[PDB]
Design a protein around this ligand. Structure first.
Ligand code: ATP
Ligand code: ATP
Ligand code: MG
Ligand code: MG
Lengths: 505, 58, 79
């Protein structure tokens, strides 16, 4: 009976009330204070559920199906929880009316069916030629981010960045996002961001008298040191005579000139490593006419290997012409007071990098977050091909469409369907609420102007406050993220109904 | 009232005389950037407090 | 010594300055809390914070430009 079922529903209603004010734009941020007293203002759905201790089994089970994703995007997480907890909310009112859950499941399952298929016979075909569209869909992701510093600048980048990487695979475009590096240098201006055609290494060339820009680079990616190593690294030496000393530390220093001659044996003109270059070896490279980089991050040597077609060499006695990385031109370039190596004209044409400049020290990170996400949304639309209008449009229709279905479904199962439709309008009602307008007024002004096909892309513009076309204001979203979120969400909702008892050991 | 005309823009308040006067023409002049970064500082904080809905703690 | 999150957050935005000499630091705190104070009086009339933020923002604008289109040019030879 009532026994355990309340506790589950209650636990869920609780989580809903924790995120409610933060759904869509105009959302009212939450403050999170750590155990050592450190403060975080945010609206990240995920963290707020993860970072919490939920006593109840029920909540964690619901957030487990809601939060997650098995694809390379992280969008739909606030809608997934909320629509789910509203569906749980709306189901209680049927248990009050004395409708068994076996009926509510069959009703909602049948409603969900039609509700799913109404995104299929409505989604719009978006391909690679619609680059004037990805610009919009992109901005639609960045616009509710914290930073308002030149987002058009960044929105344009995300398009160029995904369309460059786009490869025709199995007669359909695919995008392997890993072909994009992100480097950030705080300050200057956000307007100074640009896209680099090639991998970018954040360290300098070890002597400025080497070539500024070197022609037809035969790079040598060297993992092993090019500096002497210690005979006293763990503990002190056992030599007693300095003549014996000498001949040790002498032959080990001729071992680096040996390594340098083994690398130039290959015809290398530039050389990058992740360990040192001895000062007698900088001097050795200066006299030969070679361009050397000392202690660069191996994390970007890896990324520079499969971009220039070279190999990250762990033994200087194994380097071959085969292993030298090729690039049309390598140079060192200055950014304020810092200098990085850039390697344009690399053999892999898909491998590119983004250089962020501007903002404050923590804001620049969030600009990187936003860009990760923005590349995501655009890539995932491309990978799919389908995209619907945001702003509650496709939602309001699945409600209207469900309500027309309701009569025909049967007795009690009509009320299930009619509830499902009501839970879906409640979503847009929360969104309207959080804008500071009346949910009923606007819900009705819209759901009457949505009966004819002429108004398919009508939603509610969260700053105007009256029904308009969101498609023609750039507010579009991935048709499949908002499709797997609903499937996920209903699964969870009805799982909360499935529980007759909880037995704890 | 004595600042209604545009000619009396540099009017402020005499802190010893105690009467509205033109401070430019009395030697009390100040860096124009300080009373500008103050305003940006203050509104950021202001608008940010209003942005907090509720508090969670460890 | 403040443990209230909001106060610690406030003092951080107000006190700190990214330039060598620091002035306006008393002004910064009073005007901030006053902007917060005078906003309370609108909340009391049931007005929602998203309006008050956008209201103030549009005002911050006018307020900023009103210092620019008015300052007098001082140089190395105005000793
Ligand atoms: N300017 C706008 N006017 C109207 N609706 C908007 C606007 N911008 C976005 N929306 C709608 O707001 C809805 C909810 O936004 P949000 O993206 O915050 O929910 P979410 O996708 O579940 O959260 P997250 O993106 O963090 O996972 C979106 O699905 C979108 O259609
Ligand atoms: N005799 C005076 N007549 C008019 N105003 C005066 C006079 N002396 C001081 N002032 C005004 O006093 C104001 C406030 O000074 P104060 O420096 O204490 O504020 P603050 O700059 O916020 O504090 P701090 O400099 O420590 O950060 C100045 O902006 C200045 O114009
Ligand atoms: Mg989203
Ligand atoms: Mg002062």
């Amino acid at each position: 009976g009532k026994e355990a079922v309340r506790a589950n529903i209650a636990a869920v209603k609780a989580v809903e009330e924790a995120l409610k004010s933060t759904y869509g734009p105009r959302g009212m941020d939450k403050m999170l204070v750590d155990s050592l007293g450190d403060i975080t203002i945010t609206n990240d759905g995920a963290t707020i559920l993860d970072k919490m201790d939920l006593q109840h089994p029920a909540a964690k089970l619901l957030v487990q199906i809601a939060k997650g994703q098995d694809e390379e995007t992280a969008d739909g997480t606030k809608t997934a929880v909320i629509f789910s907890g509203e569906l749980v909310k709306k189901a209680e009112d049927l248990l009050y009316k004395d409708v068994h859950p076996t009926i509510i499941i069959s009703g909602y399952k049948k409603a969900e069916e039609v509700a799913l298929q109404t995104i299929q016979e409505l989604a719009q075909t978006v391909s690679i030629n619609d680059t004037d569209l990805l610009r919009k869909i992109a901005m639609t992701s960045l616009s509710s981010k914290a930073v308002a510093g030149a987002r058009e600048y960044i929105a344009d980048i995300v398009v160029k960045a995904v369309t460059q990487v786009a490869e025709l695979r199995g007669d359909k475009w695919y995008v392997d996002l890993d072909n994009i590096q992100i480097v950030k240098k705080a300050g200057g201006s956000i307007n100074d961001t640009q896209l680099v055609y090639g991998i970018v290494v954040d360290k300098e060339v070890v002597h400025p008298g080497m070539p500024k820009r070197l022609e037809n680079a035969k790079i040598a990616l060297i993992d092993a040191s090019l500096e002497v190593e210690k005979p006293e690294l763990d503990a002190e030496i056992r030599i007693n005579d300095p003549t014996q000393m000498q001949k040790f530390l002498d032959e080990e220093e001729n071992l680096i000139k040996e390594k340098v001659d083994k690398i130039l044996a290959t015809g290398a003109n530039v050389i990058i490593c992740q360990k040192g270059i001895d000062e007698v070896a900088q001097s050795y490279l200066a006299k030969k006419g070679v361009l050397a980089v000392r202690r660069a991050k191996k994390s970007d040597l890896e990324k520079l290997a499969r971009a220039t077609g070279g190999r990250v060499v762990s033994n200087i006695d194994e380097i071959s012409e085969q292993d030298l990385g090729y690039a049309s031109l390598i140079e060192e370039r200055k950014v304020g007071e810092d200098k990085m190596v850039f390697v344009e004209g690399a053999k892999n044409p898909k491998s590119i990098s983004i250089l962020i400049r501007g903002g404050l020290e923590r804001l620049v990170d969030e600009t990187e977050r936003a860009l990760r996400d923005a590349l995501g949304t655009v890539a995932d639309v491309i990978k799919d091909g389908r995209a619907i209008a945001g702003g509650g449009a496709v939602e309001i229709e699945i409600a209207k469409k469900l309500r027309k279905y309701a009569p025909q479904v049967g007795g009690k199962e009509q009320l299930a369907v009619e509830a499902y439709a009501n839970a879906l309008e409640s979503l847009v009602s929360i969104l309207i609420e959080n804008a500071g307008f009346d949910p009923i007024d606007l819900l009705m002004k819209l759901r009457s102007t949505h009966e004819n096909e002429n108004n398919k892309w009508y939603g509610i513009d969260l700053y105007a406050g009256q029904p308009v076309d969101m498609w023609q204001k750039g507010v579009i979203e991935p048709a499949l993220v908002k499709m797997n979120a609903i499937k996920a969400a209903t699964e969870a909702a009805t799982l909360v109904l499935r529980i007759d008892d909880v037995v704890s050991a």
